[PDB]
Enzyme design. Structure first.
Site, PDB file in Angstrom:
ATOM      1  N   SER A   1      -8.264  -8.391   8.774  1.00 18.06           N
ATOM      2  CA  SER A   1      -7.728  -7.132   9.286  1.00 18.06           C
ATOM      3  C   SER A   1      -8.016  -6.747  10.725  1.00 18.06           C
ATOM      4  O   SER A   1      -7.482  -5.735  11.199  1.00 18.06           O
ATOM      5  CB  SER A   1      -8.096  -5.966   8.360  1.00 18.06           C
ATOM      6  OG  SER A   1      -7.406  -6.131   7.115  1.00 18.06           O
TER       7      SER A   1
ATOM      8  N   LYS B   1      -5.008  -6.216  12.872  1.00 14.90           N
ATOM      9  CA  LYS B   1      -4.200  -4.997  12.852  1.00 14.90           C
ATOM     10  C   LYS B   1      -4.215  -4.264  14.177  1.00 14.90           C
ATOM     11  O   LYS B   1      -3.285  -3.530  14.498  1.00 14.90           O
ATOM     12  CB  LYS B   1      -4.650  -4.092  11.693  1.00 14.90           C
ATOM     13  CG  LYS B   1      -4.407  -4.771  10.328  1.00 14.90           C
ATOM     14  CD  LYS B   1      -4.932  -3.948   9.167  1.00 14.90           C
ATOM     15  CE  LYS B   1      -4.677  -4.663   7.852  1.00 14.90           C
ATOM     16  NZ  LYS B   1      -5.266  -3.948   6.692  1.00 14.90           N
TER      17      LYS B   1
ATOM     18  N   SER C   1      -7.328   0.423   6.811  1.00 13.61           N
ATOM     19  CA  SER C   1      -6.997  -0.992   6.619  1.00 13.61           C
ATOM     20  C   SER C   1      -5.935  -1.165   5.522  1.00 13.61           C
ATOM     21  O   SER C   1      -5.972  -2.112   4.730  1.00 13.61           O
ATOM     22  CB  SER C   1      -8.255  -1.822   6.298  1.00 13.61           C
ATOM     23  OG  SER C   1      -8.091  -3.144   6.819  1.00 13.61           O
TER      24      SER C   1
HETATM   25  B1  LIG Z   1      -8.457  -6.378   5.909  1.00  9.44           B
HETATM   26  O1  LIG Z   1      -9.233  -7.538   6.220  1.00  9.44           O
HETATM   27  O2  LIG Z   1      -9.327  -5.230   5.798  1.00  9.44           O
HETATM   28  C1  LIG Z   1      -7.662  -6.573   4.560  1.00  9.44           C
HETATM   29  N1  LIG Z   1      -8.400  -7.314   3.564  1.00  9.44           N
HETATM   30  C2  LIG Z   1      -7.931  -7.624   2.325  1.00  9.44           C
HETATM   31  O3  LIG Z   1      -6.812  -7.289   1.935  1.00  9.44           O
HETATM   32  C3  LIG Z   1      -8.865  -8.438   1.403  1.00  9.44           C
HETATM   33  C4  LIG Z   1     -10.146  -7.958   1.084  1.00  9.44           C
HETATM   34  O4  LIG Z   1     -10.491  -6.693   1.495  1.00  9.44           O
HETATM   35  C5  LIG Z   1     -10.397  -5.598   0.573  1.00  9.44           C
HETATM   36  C6  LIG Z   1      -9.584  -4.676   1.277  1.00  9.44           C
HETATM   37  C7  LIG Z   1     -11.102  -8.765   0.334  1.00  9.44           C
HETATM   38  C8  LIG Z   1     -10.757 -10.031  -0.085  1.00  9.44           C
HETATM   39  C9  LIG Z   1      -9.485 -10.591   0.178  1.00  9.44           C
HETATM   40  C10 LIG Z   1      -8.517  -9.782   0.933  1.00  9.44           C
HETATM   41  C11 LIG Z   1      -7.214 -10.401   1.169  1.00  9.44           C
HETATM   42  C12 LIG Z   1      -6.910 -11.694   0.702  1.00  9.44           C
HETATM   43  C13 LIG Z   1      -7.896 -12.433  -0.021  1.00  9.44           C
HETATM   44  C14 LIG Z   1      -9.128 -11.888  -0.264  1.00  9.44           C
END
Ligand SMILES: *[B]([O])([O])[C][N]C(=O)C1=C(O[C][C])[C]=[C]C2=C1[C]=[C][C]=[C]2
Length: 263
Positions: A45, A48, A105
């Protein structure tokens, strides 16, 4: 050469069992401190910020863009959408999507930013336009967070991301109004207290964007205003060898503490 700070970051990395990447730019003198500064890490993230900035750039020639409504449908929801789910079968403006993506996020919000830019490559194109030849966004949410070791997709280096964050938040990659808006969003982030910020003196203020993904990838990029000195830009990336590794925000705080103590 290896400095005292780099030696301490190496020791922290060794005890963590993972791979740590750090890049600091001290705007008091433009000096930099890097640890694995040129190795690639999955952004997750933290990407972003580039997407929100790209939309801010488009808004410089379209005064009403940020107020433009974007439809949110049930099918648009992905794995994490704390804000977007409240708007299903309704709409969110681009400003609302940017704020949700950055401060909470929200992944659905990020996908709307990516779509507005014409796909992941639209984000990469903006990065190139502002001098970042390293950043690459290849996929949408949630797959851009797979963070597989050795995979070049959706990665960047600490050096490149620190340079870019500086140009976006303190420099002139964006118009003044847009720079102010980006900084306001970052300073209002709700997810960073346990990361870079936890390693800084409490009197300091900052704006940041965290990142999390598979292989216990734990990231944070921040603009920092220390008490009594010029701002700093700091990137801390961390990823682990096992796909199901646990989050380690404390390692980012530890890296930030070492960086701060080295000033
Ligand atoms: B960003 O990095 O904050 C978005 N992250 C994810 O969607 C995500 C997390 O974070 C919880 C919000 C944990 C583990 C993951 C994630 C996305 C794909 C695979 C594993």
């Amino acid at each position: 050469q290896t400095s005292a700070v780099q030696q301490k970051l190496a020791a922290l990395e060794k005890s963590s069992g993972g791979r740590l990447g750090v890049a600091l730019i001290d705007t008091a003198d433009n000096t930099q401190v890097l640890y694995r500064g040129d190795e690639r890490f999955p952004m997750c993230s933290t990407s972003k910020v580039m997407a929100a900035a790209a939309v801010l750039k488009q808004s410089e020639t379209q005064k009403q863009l940020l107020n433009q409504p974007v439809e949110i449908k049930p099918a648009d929801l992905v794995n994490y959408n704390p804000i977007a789910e409240k708007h299903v079968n309704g709409t969110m403006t681009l400003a609302e999507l940017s704020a949700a993506a950055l401060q909470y996020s929200d992944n659905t919000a990020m996908n709307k930013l990516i779509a507005q830019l014409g796909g992941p490559g639209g984000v990469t194109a903006f990065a190139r336009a502002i001098g970042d030849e390293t950043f690459r966004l290849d996929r949408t949410e949630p797959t851009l967070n797979t963070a597989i070791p050795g995979d070049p997709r959706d990665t960047t280096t600490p050096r490149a991301m620190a340079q870019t964050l500086r140009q976006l938040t303190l420099g002139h990659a964006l118009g003044e109004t847009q720079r102010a808006q980006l900084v306001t969003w970052l300073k209002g982030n709700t997810t960073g207290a346990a990361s870079i910020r936890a390693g800084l003196p409490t009197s300091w203020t900052a704006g940041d964007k965290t990142g999390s993904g598979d292989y216990g990838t734990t990231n944070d990029i921040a603009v920092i205003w220390p008490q009594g000195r010029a701002p700093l830009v700091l990137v801390t990336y961390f990823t682990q060898p096992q796909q199901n590794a646990e989050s380690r925000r404390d390692v980012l705080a530890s890296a930030a503490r070492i960086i701060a103590e080295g000033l």
